[PDB]
Specification:
This is part of a larger assembly, with chains A (106 residues), B (197 residues), C (157 residues) and D (127 residues).
Chain A (H helix, E strand, L loop, with lengths): L7 E10 L4 E10 L5 H4 L6 E7 L9 E11 L5 E6 L11 E4 L7
Antiparallel strand pairs in A: 1-2, 1-6, 2-5, 3-4, 3-6, 4-5
Chain B lengths: L3 E5 L5 H13 L3 E5 L5 E3 L2 H12 L17 H10 L7 H7 L2 E3 L12 E2 L6 H4 L6 E3 H8 L4 H37 L2 H8 L3
Parallel strand pairs in B: 1-2, 1-5, 2-4
Antiparallel strand pairs in B: 3-6
Helix pairs in contact in B: 1-3, 2-6
Chain D lengths: L39 H4 L27 E5 L2 H4 L9 E5 L5 H14 L2 E2 L9
Parallel strand pairs in D: 1-2, 2-3
Classes of the chains: A mainly beta (106), B alpha/beta (197), C alpha+beta (157), D alpha/beta (127).
The complex binds magnesium ion (MG) (45 copies).
Chain D binds 4 RNA strands through helix 1, strand 1 and helix 3.
RNA sequence: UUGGCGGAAAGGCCUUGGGUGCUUGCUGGCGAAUUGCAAUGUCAUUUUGCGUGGGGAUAAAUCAUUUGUAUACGACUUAGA
RNA sequence: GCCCUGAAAAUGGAUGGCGCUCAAGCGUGUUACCUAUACUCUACCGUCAGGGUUGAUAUGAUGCCCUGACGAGUAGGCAGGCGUGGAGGUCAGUGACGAAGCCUAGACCGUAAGGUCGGGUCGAACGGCCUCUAGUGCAGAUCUUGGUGGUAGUAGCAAAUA
RNA sequence: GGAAUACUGCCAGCUGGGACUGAGGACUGCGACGUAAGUCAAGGAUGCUGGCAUAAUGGUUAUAUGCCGCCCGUCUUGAAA
RNA sequence: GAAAUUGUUGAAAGGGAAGGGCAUUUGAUCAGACAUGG
């Protein structure tokens, strides 16, 4: 097993926003391979996770996770909306994100 | 979906390649553009020479240093179109642009790396036929670019090597075919075929 | 005094709840989940392992088995919402699967000799049925993982 | 050791500092409503400070409760303390700042007895 | 380890001869649990300090002084074992 | 119709920018998509309105309770509150075993005016509640007095022979 | 000649996925399913299960990052001027 | 023995001002527990 991965690869594009006013409370996400609202429905409800590092080790681990879930589709092009427990950093715009298979309905 | 993405600048339309390249960066994609000299601009040469000259005549009146800078080489003619489509004065923007690299002719690392094209910025696919367009290198040399000749020299020299390379490779797969056959219609062959392979 | 005493003070009776009207109705599983269907566990200790569905316990969970000798996974509980039910399925007629229930798993460190035995009973039958079809055993041992350009949202399983 | 009570929701925890209290020293954070004819604040332009208004009113129930679950009651001495003799899951005691070290042991003691809560034990305490 | 090739930023590429770990091309014998139904479970590379032992090298610059091809002050340019 | 000519101004520059030529232009049609303090449902604050309720039944009848609607605001009106010096009354209120005061990217309460506490500093006084009373609340007035900055180790300290 | 189908509209037809909410706190109302005992989705969430302890969580503060924010006071039809 | 203003020490930030609003990362800091058998 060269591969170990059970998530689909995703990007963090943006907060929800108008031209000139943003909303940190929702986050727009680009899910690799997904190209349409139709498609992006599959991942609604699924669990997102932003995984980052830090100096001050907490749980024996210096790796931390921001969790949240995909909530609805966005636009016409497979892009999708997410709430996280705590809104994502914004320095994270263009960072990678992880979209999981649970809660599975397959 | 690729750590880095090399784009053969050739036959692309500046503004459209610029627009796609620029969104890629903002999304976290590392892009490196090669052969910027063989890049296109819609409209006939004279037009875009005229345009560049309008760009040229602007400069801080009291100190030409402060005022707008007029990069001449194709890579940077393109970087201008590109930067104009990024919020380049913000932290985010500065970061975006630091995921970009733009060369004329394709120069090491990438000499042996695979480049791609961007269909939705592919001049041939895009421009109506008969419509006049501009080659970026000719434009540049025309407004002061010093190095078209050299890039031409190095490019040819490289195309030489790359040929013997491809010719080797095109022949290796000859050898791979000679032994492909012996297994081509073996038993697992017909078996893999069952499942689409 | 430092502060004038309040004129009211509430009561310190704590009221009763209102007679709620929620009632535990049963939970029908999704149609992909039938006993003997191969499962892909998506979370937890055994993520990515392929595994055989057995029974649907009273606490909404799925009895699971592996089998153990096939890939280290025990007779175990797992939540239905964290599993990709696959298309493939092994017969489970000749497997007992009666004694297992909520209380069976109820934590009373050191594994009982019962559990270890029950495993062997259940497994020997499953591995019997598994081995019938070619590569089902080997499949069952290999772990699932998304390869490059897998699009789960229209892969089959 | 306190009553039920709904989730204490605060709904605007930040402070409400007077406009330009950060600009000039002479201007104190204590709120004051901007009166001026031009002011962006009085006019509520996007991007400025928020002003106190009644919509931030706290839930009438959870109002006045400290995190514990009790309205705190300022207590000067033991007679004052004993007003909280019944209402124990309701109130807790704040021992007055000016209460001598010695008497605080007495109030502390009596409250431990009565089961009344003290918001600030280890007041004037010798450790 | 044998040959080569690469200067556009070559700092990489092809090739020779063995050695050696693995090999899922194939057939066996074990192991996995109790991490208790998800959380929280591969650790990637930067620097920077110390630590072991192995190889290795054994300088100048500035201040001051001095020149006037220089100079408002710094700066410049010379000179001194 | 579109395009071309007619079409000349002063710092270098503006379909907002980049840039766009079967458009990213012009005319038209068809869908989808993005987004306001507006609309829909819900919580909570307040305001107004309409009711219910002390028959004897522990602690608020100006109170408790049920229901509906509504919320922009200068000049301005009114209401309800916050805070200060002094006065009557009361907590037989706090206090040299530490009053008041001052310090505190320490804590709590209130939408707020503010209130409360801890720690440090201090050293002789001082609060709460009902009421009375006013020389009662500052950012401004080229406001008054005082105190202090940047300017700045700066301008300069070069007439009158040495 | 006999059909389908599109388009439009209706069903007090069935059904899957996702999202936010869970105010109230004995009973009392209107009902529904039942041959009945009784049960119910019927005047507002319950059940089961797990996790947290020099911790989960939260308040404050500093900084960074995304978007946003001209100097108050004044006279004025109009002031960042 | 307040403030302006200042020296030292400590932490931090700083591509043509500073300061603010909503939001979260990161660091610092502060919480509310309540009690069960030996
Ligand atoms: Mg949006
Ligand atoms: Mg073009
Ligand atoms: Mg140009
Ligand atoms: Mg010029
Ligand atoms: Mg901007
Ligand atoms: Mg070359
Ligand atoms: Mg059901
Ligand atoms: Mg094995
Ligand atoms: Mg006005
Ligand atoms: Mg005393
Ligand atoms: Mg070995
Ligand atoms: Mg999870
Ligand atoms: Mg001289
Ligand atoms: Mg003319
Ligand atoms: Mg024009
Ligand atoms: Mg026109
Ligand atoms: Mg059009
Ligand atoms: Mg029209
Ligand atoms: Mg149109
Ligand atoms: Mg609103
Ligand atoms: Mg109003
Ligand atoms: Mg008053
Ligand atoms: Mg008062
Ligand atoms: Mg007074
Ligand atoms: Mg007076
Ligand atoms: Mg301070
Ligand atoms: Mg004192
Ligand atoms: Mg004295
Ligand atoms: Mg009065
Ligand atoms: Mg006066
Ligand atoms: Mg003043
Ligand atoms: Mg002033
Ligand atoms: Mg001096
Ligand atoms: Mg001087
Ligand atoms: Mg003079
Ligand atoms: Mg003289
Ligand atoms: Mg219908
Ligand atoms: Mg409730
Ligand atoms: Mg925290
Ligand atoms: Mg702005
Ligand atoms: Mg001001
Ligand atoms: Mg005028
Ligand atoms: Mg003004
Ligand atoms: Mg003194
Ligand atoms: Mg704690």
């Amino acid at each position: 097993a060269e591969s170990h991965r059970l998530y689909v690869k995703g990007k963090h594009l943006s907060y929800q926003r108008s031209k000139r006013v943003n909303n940190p409370n929702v986050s727009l996400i680009k899910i690799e391979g997904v190209a349409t609202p139709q498609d992006a429905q599959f991942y609604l409800g699924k669990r997102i996770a932003y995984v980052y590092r830090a100096s001050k080790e907490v749980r024996g681990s210096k790796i931390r996770v921001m969790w949240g879930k995909v909530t609805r589709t966005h636009g016409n092009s497979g892009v999708v909306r997410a709430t996280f427990r705590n809104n994502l950093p914004a320095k994270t715009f263009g960072a990678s994100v992880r979209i999981f298979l649970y809660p599975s309905n397959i | 979906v690729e750590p880095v993405v090399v784009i053969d600048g050739k036959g692309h339309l500046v503004g459209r390649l610029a627009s796609v390249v620029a969104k890629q960066l903002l999304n976290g994609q590392k892009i490196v553009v090669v052969r910027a000299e063989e890049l296109n601009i819609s409209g006939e040469f004279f037009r875009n020479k005229l345009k560049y000259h309008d760009f040229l005549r602007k400069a801080t009146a009291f100190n030409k240093t402060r005022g707008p800078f007029h990069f001449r080489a194709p890579s940077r003619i393109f970087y201008k179109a590109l930067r104009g489509m990024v919020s380049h004065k913000t932290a985010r923007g500065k970061a975006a642009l630091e995921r970009l690299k733009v060369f004329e002719g394709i120069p090491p690392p990438y000499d042996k790396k695979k480049r791609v094209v961007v269909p939705q910025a592919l001049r041939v696919l895009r421009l109506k036929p008969g419509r006049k367009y501009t080659t970026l290198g000719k434009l540049s040399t025309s407004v002061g670019w010093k190095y078209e000749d050299v890039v031409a020299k190095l490019e040819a020299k490289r195309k030489v090597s790359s040929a013997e390379y491809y010719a080797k490779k095109r022949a290796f797969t000859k050898k791979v075919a000679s032994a492909n056959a012996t297994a081509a219609e073996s038993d697992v062959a017909k078996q893999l075929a069952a499942l689409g392979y | 005094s430092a502060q004038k005493a309040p004129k009211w003070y509430p009561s310190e009776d704590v009221a009763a709840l209102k007679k709620t009207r929620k009632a535990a109705r049963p939970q029908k599983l999704r149609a992909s989940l039938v006993p003997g269907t191969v499962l892909i566990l998506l979370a937890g200790r055994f993520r990515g392992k392929r595994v055989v569905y057995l029974k649907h316990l009273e606490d909404n969970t799925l009895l699971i088995s592996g089998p153990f000798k096939v890939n280290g996974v025990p007779l175990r509980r797992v939540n239905a919402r964290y599993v990709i039910a696959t298309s493939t399925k092994v017969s489970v007629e000749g497997v007992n699967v009666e004694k297992f229930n909520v209380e069976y798993f109820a934590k009373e460190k050191e594994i009982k000799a019962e559990r270890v035995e029950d495993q062997k009973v259940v497994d020997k039958a499953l591995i019997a049925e598994i081995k019938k079809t070619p590569l089902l055993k080997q499949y069952l041992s290999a772990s699932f993982s998304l390869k490059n350009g897998d699009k789960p949202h229209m892969l089959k399983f | 050791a306190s009553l039920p009570h709904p989730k204490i929701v605060k709904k605007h925890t930040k402070k409400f500092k007077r406009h330009h209290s950060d600009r000039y020293h002479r201007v104190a954070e204590n709120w004051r409503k901007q009166k001026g004819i031009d002011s962006v604040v009085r006019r509520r332009f996007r991007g400025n400070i928020s002003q106190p208004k009644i919509g931030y009113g706290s839930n009438k129930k959870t109002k006045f409760l400290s995190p514990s679950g009790h309205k705190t009651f300022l207590v000067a001495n033991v007679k004052d303390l004993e007003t909280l003799t019944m209402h124990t899951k309701t109130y807790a005691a704040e021992i007055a700042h000016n209460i001598s070290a010695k008497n605080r042991v007495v109030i502390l003691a009596r409250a431990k007895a009565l089961g009344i809560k003290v918001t600030n034990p280890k007041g004037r305490l010798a450790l």
